[PDB]
Amino acid sequence: EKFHYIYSCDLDINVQLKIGSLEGKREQKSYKAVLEDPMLKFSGLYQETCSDLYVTCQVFAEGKPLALPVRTSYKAFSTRWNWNEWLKLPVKYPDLPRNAQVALTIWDVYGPGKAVPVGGTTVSLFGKYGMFRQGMHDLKVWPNVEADGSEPTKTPGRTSSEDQMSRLAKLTKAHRQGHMVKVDWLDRLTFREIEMINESEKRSSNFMYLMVEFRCVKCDDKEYGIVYYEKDGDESSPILTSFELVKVPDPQMSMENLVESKHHKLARSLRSGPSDHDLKPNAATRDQLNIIVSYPPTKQLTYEEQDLVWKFRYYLTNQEKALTKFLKCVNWDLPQEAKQALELLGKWKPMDVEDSLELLSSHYTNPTVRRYAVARLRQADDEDLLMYLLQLVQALKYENFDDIKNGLLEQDLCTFLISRACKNSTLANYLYWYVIVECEDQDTQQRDPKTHEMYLNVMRRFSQALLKGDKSVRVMRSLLA
C-alpha cells in the first residue's frame, strides 16, 4: 500500500554486493590450442573441474572506474563455483551517478604470475527509472573477456528480452516472489516447458551466469528502495518569467573575481617574512619606490605599484610617509594579509599627523588602523587639533557607531576628541557647536538617522564625560549649557 524509498545521496553507507554462484559449463579449448601453447595445460581450466575462481567488482561510471577493484576472498571449490561473500564495495551510495555500473570479472589461473578472465558481466546499479538494484540477479557472463565498464557496456549482464530464458527467468522470479498469479495446474506444466527450454539452451549454448545480490535496506520492518537523487536536484530553477530593466543577465554580476583573488595571493606572498629583513630593493627599484611614496594621497596605486610596495614592505618600514601607501595595498577582508599589515604597522617608523588624517577617512574602516591614526594624532598640539576639529567631527561619520552608543590604540576617535576637549577648554568650546550642529541638522534626522543618532550619542557622551571630569571641568558643562 506504500512505497518506501530514500535518495542515493542520503544513504551515506558503503554499497554492498553478494557474489553468489557461477552457473554453467565452461568451454574447454581443443587440445589443438594446448599444442600451440603448452602452458595452457597448467591453467585452471584443464587441471580441475572447478578451479578456485575469484570475482573482481569495480564500480564504473561514464567509462571511468570510481574506485579500486574489490575482490572475493579465496574459497575452495570442488563441484560448484559458489561464493557467498558480500563484497563491501569501495563506494558509497551518494558517490554513484545515474550511470554507475558494476563490472564483475571472473578470473582463473594461467600458470604462475598470470590470471586470465573466465568471463565478465556488467550491470548498471540503477534500473530503468533510477531505483537501485533491489535484489537477486542472474547476470549473463560474456566468456573469455574481461568485464567492460564503458558506456554502453560491450558485455552487458542484462537485457532490456530478445531470448526465451531472459524473459522466462524474470517471470519465474516474479512468480516465486508472488508477484505473478499462482495457478497450480498451469505452473506444474509451464515450468516443465521452461525446464525443457532451459535444458535445450544449456545444450545448444554454453553461456554461463553469475548470481549477485544487493542488500535490501530495512528500518522498523520497512524496506527502502534507493532512488538516484541529488541534493539541490530537489529545487526547480527560479528563472524569472519576465524582465524589462535587465535585458542582458550576467551570471557573474556580484561574484568575487577569482582571477584577481588568485593574483593577490601570489604577488603579495607573506612567506618572504624572513628573507625581507636581508633582501632590499636595488638601485633600479629604489628610484621606483621613491616615486610611489611621493604620490598624492588620492593617487590609487596600480597593481604593479601595490606589488612593489609589498615586496619591499620591510624596506619602506624605514619611511614615515611610505606607511600611507602600504595600508592601501593591504586587503582588509583577508585575515592573512591583515594579520601581517597590523604587524608591520607596529614596526613602521610612524607617520605624521598630516598622514594620520588619511587613515581616518572613509576608505579605512579596520579598527586597528583607525586607532593607530589616533595613536599619532595624539602626538600633536591641541592648538592644531583645534583647527582639524572641524574635519575630525566629520570623521566620526566613519567611526563605529556601536562604540559610541555603548561607550558610556587606547582610544577611539570620539573618546580621543572628548578626552582632548576636557584637557583644553578651547577645544571643548568648538566641539560643542560642531556636534550640536549635527544634532540640529533636521536633514540628517531624516536622510541618515543612524548618523544623526550617533552625534546625539556623541553629545550625550560629552555631556557625561564632562560631568565625570574634575571640578574645574564640570564647570564647562554648565558653561556650555
Binding site: 581443443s30 587440445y31 589443438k32 594446448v34 599444442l35 603448452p38
Partner: protein, 93 residues
Amino acid sequence: AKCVQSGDFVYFDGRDRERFIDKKERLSRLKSKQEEFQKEVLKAMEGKWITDQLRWKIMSCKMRIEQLKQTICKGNEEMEKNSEGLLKTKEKN
C-alpha cells in the same frame, strides 16, 4: 677507531687468542676454497646439464605424445559423432 687499525684486538672476555687479522685471513682462504669447489662443481654440472636437457626433451615429447594421442582420440570421437549425425540427417532429409 684505533683498535680496528691495529688488528691486535681480541675478546675482552678472553674467549680466544687468535687475532682478528688471523681470522680475516682464514676467511679469505675459505672463500678461496669456495671458488674452487664451485669451479669443481660447475665442471660436473656441464655434464649433468646436458643429460638433463635430454631428459627434459624426452619428458616433454612424452607429454606431447600423451597430448597428441588424446587429440587424435578427441578428433576421432568428434568425427565419429559427426558422421553418425550426418547419416541421421541424410536419412531425415
